[PDB]
Amino acid sequence: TTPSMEDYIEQIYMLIEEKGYARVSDIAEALAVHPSSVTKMVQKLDKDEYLIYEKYRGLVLTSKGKKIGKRLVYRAELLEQFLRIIGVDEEKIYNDVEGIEHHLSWNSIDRIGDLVQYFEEDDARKKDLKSIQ
Amino acid sequence: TTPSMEDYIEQIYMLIEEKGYARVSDIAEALAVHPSSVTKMVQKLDKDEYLIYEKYRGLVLTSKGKKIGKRLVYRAELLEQFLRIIGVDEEKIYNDVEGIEHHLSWNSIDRIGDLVQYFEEDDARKKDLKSIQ
Ligand SMILES: [Mn+2]
Ligand SMILES: [Mn+2]
Numbered sequence A, B: 001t002t003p004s005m006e007d008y009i010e011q012i013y014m015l016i017e018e019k020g021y022a023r024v025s026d027i028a029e030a031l032a033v034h035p036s037s038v039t040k041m042v043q044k045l046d047k048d049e050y051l052i053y054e055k056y057r058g059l060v061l062t063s064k065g066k067k068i069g070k071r072l073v074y075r076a077e078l079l080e081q082f083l084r085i086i087g088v089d090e091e092k093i094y095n096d097v098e099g100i101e102h103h104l105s106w107n108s109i110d111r112i113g114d115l116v117q118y119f120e121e122d123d124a125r126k127k128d129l130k131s132i133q
């Protein structure tokens, strides 16, 4: 998966979970992309077997698509939590995560996860960190 | 500056500091790039006034090029220190930093810097973090 591919699967996952389906119109709006570009990507993902097209619904995710999707959602969520814990401007967190999410090994994600846990279990660690700012 | 542009300036800075000059041969080898691609980039950076060409030397950095270069070197160094502190596999740190460095605001770098300081001033914080792993 490329960065674009990962953003599409993650965005299709978010849509099924929150609403109940993925149509190309919703993808185009959400991702800030042209509708025909979504078509060419849906093709790639279908052939690479990340998704199926159901007839009177829209895009459904395969078994593989859903495993990848949930992993992508988790990663984005953790990175946001991480930048929020460390004190990054709220306005900047989403732009940072949008870019950095594709360029970290899972080993880094594993370790960022442990770092989040470190701060979550003792509030005094967070206060100490914030005193340095 | 694009990601490629930032990698070129940072790599030209590292070369002047460590050796004494930047030639295109050294850039091509270091960046894993074709020699004629370096030429087309040196052109961009010259026109955008990040570097000059001195006659019996090679690429020298402008005033602007050196300010940017040192900022890029600092950022890469801090991110490595950061991933090292959090326990990322040594083999993976450089690949992660190579990618993520271009997609973080300075506000994030400022805050990662404070996080590094947090761990550097009390060794017990590091031990606590490592016990979670
Ligand atoms: Mn994303
Ligand atoms: Mn993204």
Ligand SMILES: [Mn+2]
Residues within 6 Å of the ligand: B006, B007, B010, B076, B098, B101
């Ligand atoms: Mn670099």
Ligand SMILES: [Mn+2]
Residues within 6 Å of the ligand: B003, B007, B097, B098, B099, B101, B102
């Ligand atoms: Mn890079």
